[PDB]
Design a protein around this ligand. Structure first.
Ligand SMILES: Nc1ncnc2c1ncn2[C@@H]1O[C@H](COP(=O)(O)OP(=O)(O)O)[C@@H](O)[C@H]1O
Ligand SMILES: [Mg+2]
Lengths: 372, 7, 300, 167, 187, 7, 7
């Protein structure tokens, strides 16, 4: 049947699907690749640019660029191509037949969502659209009405407290510190062993390494001493040319940057202190309800044993009479989308879209009045 | 970004 | 060519040819050349009363009245000296070069004669640059009718100069592509760390045009430049005037090159569809080898 | 795509119900051999013109005959930019109407493009491949026009950046 | 201001850049006289836009924000606070005094501090208090041009007095009782 | 180097 | 502060 489309459209991984499902139909890296050489063979696949999984497959002869950076679109000529490949190649559905539900991180330039609306209406002519905050959709997917979401998105981390469905827009916190920064940090610290990764096709390999071998340490100094004293914590990975690398101490130093941004030369505070401060920004009479409903999300919170580290840090920070319960579902990587497939499917929501004629009347600035 | 940070 | 240029080629060519013929010592021949330019400007290089020794270059503009206001001839006088004479009947500005009193270095006067329209425009525009430099608020703000259905509302304040283009295109295809070319004009300030604040509007006219007679309507677009004292100082106002002067013509030029751009992509896709059709023609079993011309091979 | 699947299935099934063409010499002129749907000279060699429409403004009109089929396509055009691009693209398709053997140099009035498949095109060229070409055109034309629109947007942005950079 | 600046697209997050933001504030911010009118103006004309030059050479351009930052002083609901604005605070602190002295307080309200150096805060405060207070009383916002140093200037005026020399807390007295003496001598 | 580049 | 607000 006819149902709204839900396009997560994150900073590192574009996930799109139909509303009313329990899994995104299409998931692919949001990259655009263009060749950096000149073909010599006649008639063999001479085309301008590859996008999505096709770019990952042929990444040897392309230069990969991400359109979204730190949750902000910095190249619209590529974001348009991403959405075009999502509509006509991945979902294979006409754009002007279904409403769309886009996502955006909180505390973002208004020009971003204004241009999102302008693109969705002028270019693709969708009959309706909506731009919801990602953490709210994550909480909807969690299946509750109160708690603090900590969406450590790949491109951006942010915490949004919610109580009884009343979001507190003065306690939202955003930290530009996420999967891509950890990837760059891993690239920077891998040189100590002697492995040199410079090009983007190698950054993809570094991301595949991070997504597989890295893990967060329950106690940093203890793990460092253990890795220094004994070679029992090293792992082996095979690059896609036959080479074999062995990473030890590095494994838990990449995700440790999340809790200590000082490694990356930032003045900010770890995600644990970010969540604690976002909780203490709320009025006291609800803080307990948040302490027991801390929810994780995003593909950067899939590291093994991150719930334990977060719980330990928050228990050390928060008073000793509040029950801390880090709600970390084993499906968190898609929660932001899952809640979408819920929100677009509700019957009390069909009057909250941004109709095409509303835009035609009030300009693209109507997204600020309609979307929260 | 435009000012501060890149994006 | 990406950016339109401000100097006219016909004026420079004709005057340089006349000056080469005069400097070599040849007898002067007649000259009567009428032509046009952008924005409905009309040039006429001729001789006054068949006097083959004088060449008069006259120009008729569309901001007829704004240039006759007091103080709108400071720049023209300053740049043209004794060449500036009374306008020829029917035209608005007129220079007069005597082929026998031409100073040395004939390149400079021809380089300044090809920019006659740019100088007439910059003369009626530096008034507000000065009104802003001298630290006076509320100075005169006007509407230059630089075209016949479009206007340029200029206003000078204590700390800024606001220029509001009220613009509209004639053809339907040009209107449809111009809506895009003007919507996407605020995305240019990401290409430079110092670019004037640009605002686009076609729902309603700005609050600057509510006491004035600048063209308004439901088919007109409004583009507001806010030039600050880092774009209107005494060292970078030449480039600013050139750009504010040729903005509309540059947008029109690139709207008309967008079509010749799209045609190449359309030819590419046409060939790509022909390649999909080609799967229907059954491959021949034996072809006769021909020559570059197409005649029989004439050999094995 | 997957939103045109039943529409394209119906169009394809109607295409190979026509396109069962036969050789036929004219009746109203001595020895000419002309496509009977173009001349409309005899009303007995003309099948019913069948329309297959997905919505009000996207349709295919199929006019059969004994030695010719005329397939007119009215494509989706959402706004004015898509209308301009569709016009120019169909025009650049007509320009080469001898490389496309089944094409028509001018579309039927009211429709965006038109193919004219006589019997020689089904005797000398594969019939199922002609059906496949028509269906592939109908599949991909919307996507290609949308990519043209995105190209126009990119050109506008580059022109804006090239101007506002000099200030 | 740091929070609302991200709307335009400027991300100041470090304590080093908090100083830059404070400078932008005290250089360009100003209090609107009629907030809704200024919001309608800034959203319909380019007459509020002002450019600031960061220490690295970039220039930012703030419009609306110029008067949204100090407006919070009169509508703390912008910061999620529940309390009332500074004008309502003044009016309430006046109304809690005796009835006989309300008129004199109405006539001699005096601003101070470094946050009241906003162009157009005196007139806004006068308008608000006049709207709150009755019609027969006269409101005069005594805003001196040196109100950035009043707490010091007056502090000097007090110390130079000769009758004040008995109110000091001498070393011997602190040696006698302790740090609690500040609760008795100092009021 | 050992992985990436020669050295 | 100690309770309520930070300071
Ligand atoms: N199991 C994992 N362990 C560690 N990092 C992971 C894991 N899975 C994904 N990531 C990283 O986190 C990011 C995935 O986040 P994602 O949910 O795709 O958000 P976004 O849509 O913003 O990319 C990627 O950059 C990826 O490298
Ligand atoms: Mg995400």
């Amino acid at each position: 049947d006819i149902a709204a489309l839900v396009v997560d459209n994150g900073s590192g991984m574009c996930k799109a699907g139909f509303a009313g499902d329990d899994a995104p139909r299409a998931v692919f890296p949001s990259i655009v690749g263009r060749p950096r050489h000149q073909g010599v063979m006649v008639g063999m696949g001479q085309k301008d640019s590859y996008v999505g999984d096709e770019a990952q497959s042929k990444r040897g002869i392309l230069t990969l660029k991400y359109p979204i950076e730190h949750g902000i679109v910095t190249n619209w000529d590529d974001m348009e191509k991403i959405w075009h490949h999502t509509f006509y190649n991945e979902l294979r559905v006409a754009p002007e037949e279904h409403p769309v539900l886009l996502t955006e991180a909180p505390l973002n330039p208004k020009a971003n969502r204004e241009k999102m609306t302008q693109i969705m209406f002028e270019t693709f002519n969708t009959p309706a659209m909506y731009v919801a905050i990602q953490a709210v959709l994550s909480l909807y997917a969690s299946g509750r009405t109160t708690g603090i979401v900590m969406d450590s998105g790949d491109g951006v981390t942010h915490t949004v407290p919610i109580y009884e469905g009343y979001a507190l827009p003065h306690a939202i916190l955003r930290l530009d510190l996420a999967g891509r920064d950890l990837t760059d940090y891993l690239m920077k610290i891998l040189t100590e062993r002697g492995y040199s990764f410079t090009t983007t096709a190698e950054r993809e390999i570094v991301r595949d390494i991070k997504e597989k071998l890295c893990y967060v340490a329950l106690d940093f100094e203890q793990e460092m001493a253990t890795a220094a004293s004994s070679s029992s914590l090293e792992k082996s990975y095979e690059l896609p040319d036959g080479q074999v690398i062995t990473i030890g101490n590095e494994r838990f130093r990449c995700p440790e940057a999340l809790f200590q941004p000082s490694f990356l030369g930032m003045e900010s505070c770890g995600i644990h202190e970010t969540t604690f401060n976002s909780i203490m920004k709320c009025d006291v009479d609800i803080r307990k309800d948040l302490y027991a409903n801390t929810v994780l999300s995003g593909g950067t919170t899939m590291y093994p044993g991150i719930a334990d580290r977060m719980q330990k840090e928050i228990t050390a920070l928060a008073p000793s009479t509040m029950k801390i319960k880090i709600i970390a579902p084993p499906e968190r990587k898609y929660s932001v989308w899952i809640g979408g497939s819920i929100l677009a499917s509700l019957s009390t929501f069909q009057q909250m879209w941004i109709s095409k004629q509303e835009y035609d009347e009030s300009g693209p600035s109507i997204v600020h009045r309609k979307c929260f | 970004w435009x000012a501060x940070c890149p994006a | 060519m990406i950016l339109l240029e401000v100097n006219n080629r016909i004026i420079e060519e004709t005057l340089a040819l006349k000056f080469e013929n005069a400097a070599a010592g040849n007898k002067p021949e007649a000259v009567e050349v009428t032509f046009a330019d952008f924005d409905g400007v009309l040039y006429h290089i001729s001789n006054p009363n068949g006097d083959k020794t004088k060449v008069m270059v006259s120009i008729s503009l569309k901001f007829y009245k704004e240039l006759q206001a007091h103080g709108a001839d400071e720049l023209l006088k300053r740049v043209y000296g004794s060449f500036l004479v009374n306008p020829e009947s029917g035209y608005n500005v007129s220079l007069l070069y005597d082929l026998e009193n031409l100073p040395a270095s004939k390149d400079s006067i021809v380089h300044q004669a090809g920019m006659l329209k740019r100088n007439c425009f910059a003369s009626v525009f530096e008034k507000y640059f000065q009104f802003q430099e001298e630290g006076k608020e509320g100075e005169n703000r006007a509407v230059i009718h630089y075209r016949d259905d479009e206007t340029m509302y200029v206003e000078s304040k204590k700390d800024r100069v606001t220029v509001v283009f009220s613009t509209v295109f004639k053809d339907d295809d040009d209107v449809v592509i111009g809506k895009v070319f003007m919507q996407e004009f605020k995305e240019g300030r990401r290409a430079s760390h110092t670019a004037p604040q640009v605002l686009f509007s076609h729902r309603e006219p700005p609050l600057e045009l509510k006491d004035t007679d600048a063209a308004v309507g439901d088919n007109i677009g409004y583009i507001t430049f806010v030039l600050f004292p880092r774009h209107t100082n005494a060292s970078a106002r030449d480039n600013t005037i050139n750009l504010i002067h040729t903005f509309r013509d540059y947008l029109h030029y690139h709207i008309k090159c967008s079509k010749a751009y799209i045609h190449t992509r359309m030819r590419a896709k046409t060939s790509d569809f022909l390649k999909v059709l080609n799967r229907a023609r059954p491959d021949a079993e034996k072809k006769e080898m021909k020559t570059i011309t197409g005649k029989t091979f004439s050999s094995r | 795509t997957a939103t045109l699947r039943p529409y394209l299935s119906a169009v394809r099934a109607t295409l190979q119900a026509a396109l069962c063409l036969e050789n036929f010499s004219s009746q109203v002129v001595e020895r000419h051999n002309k496509p009977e749907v173009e001349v409309r000279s005899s009303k007995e060699l003309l099948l019913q013109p069948v329309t297959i429409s997905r919505n009000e403004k996207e349709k295919v009109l199929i006019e059969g005959s004994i030695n010719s089929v005329r397939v007119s396509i009215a494509v989706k055009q959402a706004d004015e930019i898509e209308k301009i691009l569709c016009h120019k693209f169909m025009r650049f398709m007509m320009m080469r109407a001898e490389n496309f053997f089944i094409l028509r140099r001018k579309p039927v009035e009211g429709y965006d493009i038109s193919f004219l498949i006589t019997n020689f095109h089904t005797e000398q060229m594969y019939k199922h491949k002609l059906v496949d070409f028509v269906i592939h055109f109908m599949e991909e034309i919307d996507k290609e026009i949308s990519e043209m629109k995105l190209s126009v947007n990119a050109r506008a942005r580059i022109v804006a950046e090239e101007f506002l950079k000099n200030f």
